[PDB]
Symmetry: C3
Subunit: 455 residues, 3 copies
């Protein structure tokens, strides 16, 4: 039999729909092709990024450990499943003992002997009330949870590799922008030095140009270091070296991702890996509850063997030395100071803990997807405003430069316009990077890229 | 008996008083009503924040798991306490075996049988030297440590909910400030466009106003996203949806907290939950030391039953088939290659580890409270200086605007004054948020809000 | 015998040499004195920092726990090593039972008794196929891994203490710079107030000076708090109070560290502690594999004792009551539904997990050392550019001040120059701190300071 209680999946303690407001667009509703089914080969349009994600999937050591844990829990489940059948082996027993007079069968001190070679099982637990079967089902649910954990680990690895790639590309763009601005500042400083050496353009302008040049140089060194360290982080995430014949990657100013649907919050209960991991852990706790109650009921043991026995060692395997033993045992606990009841309470408490953790996983998934949706709703406006800011700063800088080539305006306003333009372009690169990272993390939260191609 | 060593609480490896310096006010000394006794209903003056903290206490899943762990460790302690009494059950045993001639009692191959149904205990460990009792005391101290951990978890949850609430309110204030500044910039840009279309006010001023407008727009989008995500984080911390009929909350510019006394560092040894958790873990290690030494002394086992026995199955429960078994056993370890000594060394080492962890908990509490006191000592001056900076920036902006409505000054100085005022107000909001968060974290470090009302 | 497989250290899945590029200098190659052998007494030139690192090594509680874990794992290994030898003890057994007629030797209900006091071993497992020896070797490798973990913990503690010291010193430098700039701003504001009260210098300049003063005041309060909290963090890392008679420390503008060689990436396989920890864990998993396969082969048990036995209690220790028991047992598993095979699969999977974790430790070490090398290659240029920026800002500020003491220029340009100089000096202090922290972390990654003096 089985004393495992019925499993009822708890209600999702989240809102029926994703949040709405000044930062959220209209709820799209139920999705035909959910986010978890959109393969990462189609979500990420950059072919070099796709090849890097493949190299990471095949070489990342953390994902390797996450995949091997599934094998380990499968082996543990197979052990627990084997625990049901009798362990049949060959038992070779010998006994030789001296007994005093009052204990020996002859009345005087005597040396008795007894030898046996038998085949059979010792203390086999007949699982009549489903204790070992409940433990086996618990192990099976823990294995399924480990499999879901491996899927979640793959989604996390894909998201992290994409984030590292985009961060390296953004820092390379920043480094190139700093190169260009430093070259412009150095050209301007050389012209101002030529002017200063012939009495024109006071030291003030020369010192101003020198400050600009040195600031650009420091930023150049900083961004060089950042690019090198981003490459290091990408190599670490890949688990292997960067291939030499990578395809041509797409720039930040291009469409890098396919817009992924949000779906309903109920899609997380069936599509997000860690939620299913928590659910399988809950079902494992349920099976453990079953195993714990199986302890109140009678336990049945069987010791059964057949073979040869003799008083002499020379009498072993002789005709007529055959023997067999059949020993059933039934035990029924009557008084366990509170012990079985406390164990059952512990099992119930563990199931409640898994319920709470499953509910919190649902809530965390909801929060992360809602943050991703807020990012999707606001980053378009923020990037458009930053585009317009960079454009207007460029127009202002061009007007100041045209009013400076004519004696109209001075050098300080021109340098201020240059600095504002540089900072605006930096912030534009940063906002692009943040938008892309937010979309990648939303893709990971909705279901990730467990599938390579769209199913 | 009991071989558990005496417990002596280690001296607090911290200073007798909290640090003093340019950032710390005068030490208040011993507090009449300590910080841990001040309820969170009285520490937090915002009624909406109080209702949110209540909803979080009743719905947060992490606190639910922390409370269920106390139940689980209570069940484990009850199991260990039950382990002391004999496990009395009904044993039904059967035996049927064929023996060869030289081993059977008849001289020829014979099939012997034996059946019994008895009531009693098997291998009951008479806890004469306090091994099981020491294990039970270890389980009890671990349960008390779990209870202290639940209290610490509640304090952490209260602090986190308050921090999320204050962060959401501060970002909403930032969003409103950005709305106002963007409206001002748009009005100014429209006036400058009207002027530019009639020959007055050169393109330079128009491009300047456009840059200001676009920057304000980007900041607006950013703060909208931040407010949405802060609401998401608050909802996650609550474990439930935000109620609709919440009371009227207080603004950041109002008195939100009651100033909490610092007390002496010795108050942490009796009022902070995680320190008591570490202390209970240490006492559990002490009881484990007792259980480990109980192994060198003689162990006593008892197998005692009474019931019916027979050679035939039909002879069971017949008159005259009564039987009883009394089997005492005493074992004394003589030679254990180093095994018992190494186990005792392991127990002593575990107690030393718990001592070190208790001392480090004390030190961490001291460091956190000292950081909170430095924040209390410096944030008043910083906020006053920021108030005066915002005031002087407003005066400068008004003077520039009055010198711009008259042809006196130009547009660039006015826009620079506006930008400085906006940044000063942003920094004022940020400093208010940081002061409030520091005070909340100091309240959590001193003892938290385990009590709802002041005891 | 021993069924443990051969151990082959996996190839390092990292590049043969450290990365090269615009941020990396030329690879130095194999180092005569590797980084791990350079003692921290010689790496850190600040004598006060050396004394603080010593106080931390002697008083930090985390390092104390890391050292006690080595003792605990040594005790566990000693237990596993003791498990090989027979446990010889004194067994005192008594038996008194009533048997019915059909089971007693007299044909009628009879009370039989039997007492014995013997010395010997019970169920001693003759480790013929190396199961207990494999478990002992696994425990030994886990102990060696714990020792390597203690070494890694010491390196981490040294790096953290150095980082805290340098951060406190940098924030103190920032606080002094803010003091000086605030004093200058207050002097200028007092002069501007004197001027304004006599009709000279319009309110605009007065409000400008007031804004500067208030900003400097707020920054002063902030840096005071930061210095106090850095001192708190240093005290926490030390595990004890700061000594009063510390030696004279060196300033940030001095040479604080000795340039440490990078060596080859192959040096990490023999010099970095956590990599050796992972390797010892892998060898422990190998020994566990050996123990798991030892289960397929015959197990041998021995129950052997000698002492006195009698039917009466008065017959104990009487002449002629001597007795001895020799009971060998041999078991050979024949049918284990998949159980032994699944356990062996689990052992192999655990060894593969340890292989993957060892490889990932190697990769992480490579990434951290490469980041340190990029920092070493770029921070010199960045600090030189920041030096030149501070110098040019000082020259520009002096020119503006000389053009302001003469009626030439106004107050706004002078204040802007002052603000730029202050920010440049702040960034210089920050860049110095970051360079020093990067070099300290590179020293920790290459091998740390496990040795006090250079070996
Ligand atoms: C011979 C049958 C004796 C059964 C005695 C059961 C003693 C009470 O044990 C009960 O067993 C249940 C399992 O079905 C548990 O779920 C209950 O919580 C527990 O109280
Ligand atoms: C090592 C040699 C052990 C030999 O054991 C022998 O076994 C015989 C069994 O018949 C006995 O008769 C002998 O007394 C005994 O010495
Ligand atoms: C020789 C002892 C005979 C059995 C008497 C043991 C009585 C133990 O009493 C036990 O106390 C616990 C709480 O204290 C309860 O939870 C248990 O239900 C109860 O059995
Ligand atoms: C019959 C009594 C025999 C007792 C032999 C004890 C062997 C030495 O064992 C001792 O036991 C102590 C427990 O009291 C431990 O605390 C000691 O550290 C341990 O060395
Ligand atoms: C399944 C049927 C097992 C029947 O078992 C019977 O038990 C009897 C006990 O007296 C023996 O006499 C018989 O030999 C035996 O077959
Ligand atoms: C058949 C074996 C008879 C017993 C002899 C076993 C001797 C084991 O010697 C053991 O070595 C350990 C360290 O090596 C010590 O810590 C133990 O105190 C010591 O008993
Ligand atoms: C009496 C000897 C019987 C040995 C039967 C071994 C059954 C197969 O067991 C084998 O044992 C090996 C250990 O050497 C393992 O490494 C193998 O993977 C396992 O398949
Ligand atoms: C408590 C007192 C237990 C006394 O036990 C006695 O042991 C004797 C052994 O010869 C028996 O003869 C007695 O029947 C029995 O009562
Ligand atoms: C009374 C039962 C007699 C023994 C028959 C038990 C048959 C169990 O079959 C087992 O199934 C497993 C997978 O399902 C396999 O891995 C095992 O190799 C196999 O032994």
């Amino acid at each position: 039999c089985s004393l495992i209680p019925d499993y009822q999946r708890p209600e999702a303690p989240v809102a029926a729909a994703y949040p709405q407001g000044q930062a959220y667009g209209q709820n799209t509703g139920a999705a035909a092709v959910p986010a978890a089914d959109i393969g990462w080969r189609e979500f990420f349009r950059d072919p070099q990024l796709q090849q890097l994600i493949g190299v990471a999937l095949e070489n990342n050591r953390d994902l390797r450990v996450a995949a091997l844990n599934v094998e380990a829990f499968r082996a543990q489940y197979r052990i627990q499943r084997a625990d049901l059948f009798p362990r049949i082996g060959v038992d070779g027993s010998g006994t030789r003992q001296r007994l005093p007079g009052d204990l020996s069968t002859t009345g005087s001190p005597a040396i008795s002997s007894q030898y046996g070679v038998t085949l059979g099982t010792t203390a086999w637990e007949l699982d009549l009330f489903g204790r070992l079967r409940s433990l086996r089902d618990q192990a099976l649910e823990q294995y399924l949870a480990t499999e879901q954990a491996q899927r979640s680990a793959q989604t996390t690895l894909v998201a992290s590799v994409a984030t590292a790639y985009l961060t390296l590309k953004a820092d390379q763009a920043q480094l190139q922008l700093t190169k260009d601005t430093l070259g412009t500042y150095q050209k301007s400083f050389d012209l101002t030095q030529r002017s200063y050496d012939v009495g024109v353009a006071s030291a003030l302008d020369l010192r101003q140009a020198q400050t600009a040049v040195e600031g650009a140089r420091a930023t150049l060194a900083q961004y060089t270091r950042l690019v090198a360290q981003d490459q290091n982080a990408l190599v670490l995430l890949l688990g292997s070296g960067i291939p030499a014949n990578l395809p041509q990657g797409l720039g930040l100013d291009q469409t890098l991702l396919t817009e992924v649907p949000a779906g309903l919050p109920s899609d997380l209960l069936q599509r997000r890996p860690d939620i299913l991991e928590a659910e399988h852990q809950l079902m494992a706790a349920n099976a453990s509850i079953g195993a714990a109650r199986a302890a109140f009921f009678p336990s049945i043991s069987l010791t059964a063997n057949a073979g040869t026995m003799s008083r002499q060692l020379s009498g072993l395997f002789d005709a007529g030395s055959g023997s067999w033993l059949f020993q059933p045992s039934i035990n029924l606990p009557i008084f366990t100071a509170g012990s079985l009841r406390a164990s059952l309470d512990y099992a119930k408490i563990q199931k409640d803990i898994n319920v709470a953790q499953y509910e919190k996983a649902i809530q965390t998934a909801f929060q992360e997807v809602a943050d991703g949706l807020a990012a999707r709703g606001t980053f378009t406006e923020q990037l458009q405003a930053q585009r317009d800011l960079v454009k207007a700063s460029d127009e202002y800088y061009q007007l100041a430069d045209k009013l400076f080539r004519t004696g109209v305006d001075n050098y300080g306003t021109l340098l201020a316009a240059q600095a504002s333009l540089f900072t605006a372009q930096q912030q534009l690169i940063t906002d692009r990077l943040n938008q892309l990272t937010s979309e990648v993390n939303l893709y990971k939260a909705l279901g990730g890229g467990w599938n390579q191609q769209t199913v």
